[PDB]
Amino acid sequence: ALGLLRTFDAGEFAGWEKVGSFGQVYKVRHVHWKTWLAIKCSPSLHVDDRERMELLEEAKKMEMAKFRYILPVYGICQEPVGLVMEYMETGSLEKLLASEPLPWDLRFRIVHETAVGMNFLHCMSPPLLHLNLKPANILLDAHYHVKISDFGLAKFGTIAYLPPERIREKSRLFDTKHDVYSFAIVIWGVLTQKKPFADEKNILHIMMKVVKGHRPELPPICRPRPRACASLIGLMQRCWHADPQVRPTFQEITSETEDLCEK
Ligand SMILES: Cc1cc(Nc2cc(N3CCN(C)CC3)nc(Sc3ccc(NC(=O)C4CC4)cc3)n2)[nH]n1
Ligand SMILES: [Cl-]
Known part of the structure; x- marks a missing residue:
């Protein structure tokens, strides 16, 4: 489940732009892939081991339910601690x-x-x-x-x-x-x-x-x-x-x- 997920460094992302607000979600451009993604960041000052493991369990459950009508997941960022997902334009x-x-x-x-x-x-x-x-x-x-x-x-x-x-x-x-x-x-x-x-x-x-x-x-x-x-x-x-x-x-x-x- 968690094997195919990638780890993203924030240098791979650019043009950060709020959409949410829970946890602020951003439309980001992945510069190498030349496409957009969505990244949900942590809502706290310090992200402890409970969050990191919850954010991972959330990621793994998304991958488990890969389907046409379920949002795809790509992985986790650590730089800002966040969950990296498909961007939906509307x-x-x-x-x-x-x-x-x-x-x-x-x-x-x-x-x-x-x-x-x-x-x-x-x-x-x-x-x-x-x-x-x-x-x-x-x-x-x-x-x-x-x-x-x-x-x-x-x-x-x-x-x-x-x-x-x-x-x-x-x-x-x-x-x-x-x-x-x-x-x-x-x-x-x-x-x-x-x-x-x-x-x-x-x-x-x-x-x-x-x-x-x-x-x-x-x-x-x-x-x-x-x-x-x-x-x-x-x-x-x-x-x-x-x-x-x-x-x-x-x-x-x-x-x-x-x-x-x-x-
Ligand atoms: C996760 C995610 C979010 C998106 N895309 C978008 C895009 C969007 N906007 C589209 C562009 N107009 C001009 C403004 C609103 N507004 C939201 S509002 C929103 C924010 C977060 C979530 N869901 C989550 O927080 C996911 C992590 C569990 C749903 C809707 N989400 N793609 N993938
Ligand atoms: Cl009718």
Whole structure:
């Protein structure tokens, strides 16, 4: 796993340029390779042995899940201590959702592609749980194709993506149904181009209500694609069901999201 990863000295990089902010991420040019890469640096003053080993474990999990819809990893830098990855020109889904209204065919393709990447992770032996999926992690290339990132918590404003069973049970064991819930909240963001619970001031009250089956407000059926929109709303609702075992698998999810992209 960690054998094929390279070590980068910072002299190989140039034109450092912020994109993140967690840990500052930079678009860097590799001068010899004549292409761009992304480097996530440490957020601290001194990077001890815990970080170095965590950053390595994060790298190795990315290499383990090498796939079309998963962000590629190249290696670790030591000069500044950072993780060296593929650069994606368009950036996060969060930024894209805030920038302008997106055509529905693209919305459906983003959801499908995200679902296919998540399904890949869950098909691994053993399954790889993402556990941090949100629009800030979902990256888009120059032609708006998805690659999933952020494997730092794999095995703040993130309360909205947290399953209700994680609020009910102190230290429940993580499972595939955690990711399925988060994916539902990702769908809601694609449907509305809004952030979930943006209006609400009482963070705790909403968390308590969520344990009883409270969710982001259902959007209306859209005009341009009312059948597919209705179908996606329904799928979203099953994916955010209060009972984890009623929620669909990503095998079942991908079958359905694929049909939304047909025609
Ligand atoms: C890791 C990574 C990041 C990128 N590319 C980009 C590019 C980008 N921008 C594209 C250009 N516009 C003008 C501004 C936004 N904005 C982000 S915002 C962003 C920052 C970091 C992460 N993910 C991580 O932190 C990875 C390490 C786990 C996702 C999105 N990420 N390629 N690879
Ligand atoms: Cl339709």
